[PDB]
Structures are given as structure tokens and as C-alpha cells.
């Protein structure tokens, strides 16, 4: 656990910090794609009216 | 960096992912093709008189 | 630690899959979207 920050050292391992970073990036990319998809779906047909 | 070395490192465990994906794709394709063929070559059900 | 990272990843992924399937089913069954016609 050398690459882990001091504050999160007792909770995370050196081999898990990178995987956590990958998960965070995947979540953000998915949120952006979901925003785009929702905008197009509203452009197709409104669902609230 | 991975959390499942037994699944993302060994060939035998690496084969199961592709096997499952292919199984799902084959099932979906077969169902869709059968129902498309059935609904395309069938006459109009109810002609009123 | 209270929760292993592997368990958290598995639980989150499965919950996301179930939510996506359920939301697609409910939205497609509604009267606004008639199963994409």
C-alpha cells in the first residue's frame, strides 16, 4: 500500500486504488452517456407533458 | 490490475466470459429471427365481412 | 475494513443490471412507448 493516500490507507490496498479509479471513471462516462441519451429521448417524445 | 485473477488471468476461466456472451447472443438472435419470420409470412388474421 | 472491495463491486454491478432491465421493461410496457411500436 504505497500508492494509496494517507487518509484512505487503512481502507484500501495498492492493487485496489487503481481499480477504484477505473470504476470512478467508468461511472462518470456512463453518466455523461446517460445524459446524452436522455436528451435525445426527450427530443423524440416527452414523457412528463 | 484486476480483482479476479482466477477469471481474468487463466485461459480456462477466460473462456467462460466469451462462452456466456455467445450463448446470450445466440439465444436472442434465434428468438428474434424465428418471430420475425413467423410475423412476416403470415396473412392478415381477421378480414371483416 | 467493514466491506471488502470485491463484494462492493459485485453488489453494485448486479444492482445496476437489475435496475437497467427493470427500467427498460417498465418504460417499454407503458402507454407512451408501445414496445417501440
Amino acid at each position: 500500500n504505497d500508492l494509496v493516500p494517507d487518509q484512505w490507507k487503512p481502507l484500501f490496498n495498492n492493487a485496489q486504488w487503481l481499480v477504484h479509479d477505473i470504476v470512478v471513471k467508468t461511472i462518470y462516462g456512463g453518466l455523461i452517456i446517460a445524459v446524452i441519451a436522455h436528451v435525445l429521448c426527450w427530443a423524440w417524445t416527452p414523457w412528463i407533458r | 490490475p484486476t480483482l479476479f485473477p482466477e477469471i481474468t488471468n487463466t485461459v480456462r476461466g477466460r473462456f467462460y466470459i466469451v462462452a456466456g456472451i455467445i450463448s446470450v447472443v445466440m439465444a436472442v438472435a434465434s428468438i428474434a429471427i424465428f418471430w420475425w419470420i413467423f410475423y412476416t409470412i403470415t396473412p392478415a388474421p381477421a378480414p371483416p365481412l | 475494513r467493514p466491506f471488502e472491495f470485491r463484494t462492493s463491486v459485485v453488489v453494485s454491478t448486479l444492482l445496476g443490471l437489475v435496475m437497467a432491465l427493470l427500467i427498460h421493461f417498465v418504460v417499454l410496457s407503458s402507454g407512451a412507448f408501445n414496445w417501440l411500436r
Binding site: 452517456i33 441519451a37 435525445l40 429521448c41 423524440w44 | 484486476t2 481474468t8 477466460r14 466470459i17 456472451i21 | 417501440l36 411500436r37
Partner: peptide, 26 residues
């Protein structure tokens, strides 16, 4: 406009699947 959206989501799904498979399969 339904078929265009269907193609869009299908292409997105294919791209994501290929990217994650390449990440794992390396």
C-alpha cells in the same frame, strides 16, 4: 425515429462490450 435510436443504443452497447473485453483480455 425509433430505428435510429435502436441503432444508436445497439452501437453503444457493442462499443462498450468490445472496449471492456479488450481491457480484460490483455
Amino acid at each position: 425515429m425509433a430505428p435510429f435510436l435502436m441503432a444508436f443504443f445497439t452501437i453503444v452497447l457493442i462499443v462498450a462490450t468490445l472496449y471492456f473485453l479488450s481491457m480484460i483480455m490483455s
